[PDB]
Design a protein around this ligand. Structure first.
Ligand SMILES: [Mg+2]
Ligand SMILES: [Mg+2]
Lengths: 113, 59, 175, 79
RNA sequence: GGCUACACACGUGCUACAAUGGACAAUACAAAGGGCAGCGAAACCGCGAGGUCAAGCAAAUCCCAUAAAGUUGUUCUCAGUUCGGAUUGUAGUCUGCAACUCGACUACAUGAAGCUGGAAUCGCUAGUAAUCGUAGAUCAGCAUGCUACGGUGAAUACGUUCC
């Protein structure tokens, strides 16, 4: 565990940190710079000091909770106002102005007919 | 407690090295145990936590 | 026995002042905790219940009682005599230990903690926890989880009233 | 304007809001300018936006500032 | 404002499904084209899209412009993964009289179906298919398309039995 969530043992550090919601490759590299470990390491072999350096760096960064809250609350907000994007969120249709005549199936689900 | 079916439930130590809170109690764990977060290191107990108008005024 | 010594040393006083008690024996105590698992999948796989048993048994420290079917149901393909769940009554030093563990170790390991529920009373002074995941415990290595599963931790009291229960639990350290 | 130039608002609309800045707010303001940005000085007003065949009512709130009037007058009626 | 709708059906292309591969550091070899209130060198700032100052340039002179695939190294280890990069949220840039309807690009975070495709069907006989990038026209801004360009570079075609 690092940020209240497990991470793989056999994946290296830079990659394992990416299995948090909120933390990607860039942030992982920058975190490992700040809490200076090597990227080659693997968390089955890391020590208490290394792991705690990392935890200390990670605590400053919104992740595994507040990030889900930010996203959900932003969407609920734009729905509570009768906005275009929030109408689209309420209907299950694309938001960025794609065309729904064809090829919108991530937001529409599979083919219904 | 029947002799034959219950585990080895022995007294161990819970160390929150983040804030070094060293608590003693039992476990079936198999003596110093590692814990990262706790009632003395977790936000909600400790009470310390880490707007379209104010946003638009800065710009 | 940190929590029990705490109870007898402070909370008896800090509670009897709040509820004008003439005798110590009015004061609340936890008489037991019951820990269930409610395993309905054992119709379809008994290995499930074996894992459940082992995990309650490791968490608490005693072999859980296999509960059984009380009345037979066909929506779930469920016949009387069949095992469902398993329970564990806890009393004494082990109760106070498990409860301090809860307040101090596991609950601060929830994936998305923002507070326990605060209305989880039957109206008489008993408390339940709607747990989601079992690996939240340190005894459980997260690698041996055969199924993420929740639990129920009932807490049973000699308080007649929910507010007395709230104060007791806060004074131990519940949120 | 999605850019360091600062937002966009049409000048006539700004003037009419400053005219309505006496805060009595008896009247709906009429408009066609969906292009405009909403400011915090529009709260508690009632604007009447042109969707293409109707000057439809929209009530302004504080959750509506980094947005546009056009977000609240759907031009496409689909059932 | 709409031609950008969406319960669905078809056509034509792009990205992929991974190890003949992903990421990362070094390094190499082209064509052809365009450029005046237009191409914008170098330097500086910014993680980047870019921005400030500004030189040359109406051309075999200066610019777009460091071609990429490659080669050599490290690392990944056959998993929905370090493949994939949709979708969505945030902070931004450039253009524009204004990017919600309805621009492109960027950074961060998330990480969809997809593990080589049913019946059927298509292109191609050589510098061709296949693959890799590059330029232009329109164009304030927008190109997975259109037209042109070159780099690497196959296998097979017995024969007219049959459609
Ligand atoms: Mg059209
Ligand atoms: Mg990738």
């Amino acid at each position: 565990r690092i940020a209240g969530v497990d991470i793989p043992r056999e994946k290296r550090v830079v990659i394992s940190l990416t299995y948090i919601y909120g933390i990607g490759t860039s942030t992982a590299q920058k975190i490992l710079e700040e809490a200076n470990v090597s990227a080659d390491t693997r968390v089955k072999d890391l020590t208490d000091d290394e792991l705690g350096r990392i935890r200390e760096v990670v605590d400053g960064y919104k992740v595994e909770g507040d990030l889900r809250r930010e996203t959900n609350l932003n969407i609920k907000r734009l729905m509570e106002i009768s906005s275009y994007r929030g109408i689209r969120h309420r209907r299950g249709l694309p938001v960025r102005g794609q065309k729904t005549k064809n090829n919108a199936r991530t937001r529409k689900g599979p083919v219904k007919t | 407690m029947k002799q034959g079916i219950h585990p080895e439930y022995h007294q161990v130590i819970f160390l929150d090295t983040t804030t070094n809170f060293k608590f003693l109690s039992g476990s079936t764990k198999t003596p110093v145990i590692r814990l990262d977060i706790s009632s003395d290191s977790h936000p909600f107990y400790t009470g310390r936590q880490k707007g379209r108008v104010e946003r638009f005024n800065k710009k | 026995n940190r929590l029990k010594e705490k109870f007898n040393t402070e909370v008896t006083e800090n509670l009897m002042k709040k509820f004008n008690y003439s005798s110590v024996m009015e004061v609340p105590k936890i008489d037991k905790i019951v820990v269930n698992m409610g395993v309905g999948d054992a119709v379809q796989n008994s290995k499930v219940l074996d894992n459940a048993v082992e995990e309650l048994e490791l968490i608490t420290g005693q072999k859980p009682l296999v509960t059984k079917a009380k009345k037979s149901i066909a929506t779930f393909r469920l016949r009387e005599g069949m095992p469902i769940g398993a329970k564990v009554t806890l009393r004494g030093e082990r109760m106070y230990e498990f409860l301090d563990k809860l307040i101090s170790v596991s609950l601060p390991r929830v994936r998305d903690f923002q507070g326990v529920s605060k209305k989880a009373f039957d109206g008489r002074g008993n408390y339940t926890l709607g747990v989601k995941e079992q690996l939240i415990f340190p005894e459980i290595d997260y690698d041996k989880v055969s199924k993420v599963r929740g639990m129920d931790i009932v807490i049973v009291t000699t308080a007649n009233t929910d507010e007395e229960a709230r104060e007791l639990l806060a004074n131990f350290g519940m949120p | 304007r999605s850019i360091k130039k600062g937002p966009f608002v049409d000048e006539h609309l700004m003037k009419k809001v400053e005219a309505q800045e006496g805060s009595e707010k008896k009247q709906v303001i009429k408009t066609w300018s969906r292009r405009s940005t909403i400011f915090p000085n529009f709260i508690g007003h009632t604007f009447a936006v042109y969707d293409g065949r109707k000057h439809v009512p929209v009530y302004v709130t504080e959750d509506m500032v980094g947005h546009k009037l056009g977000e609240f007058a759907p031009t496409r009626t689909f059932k």
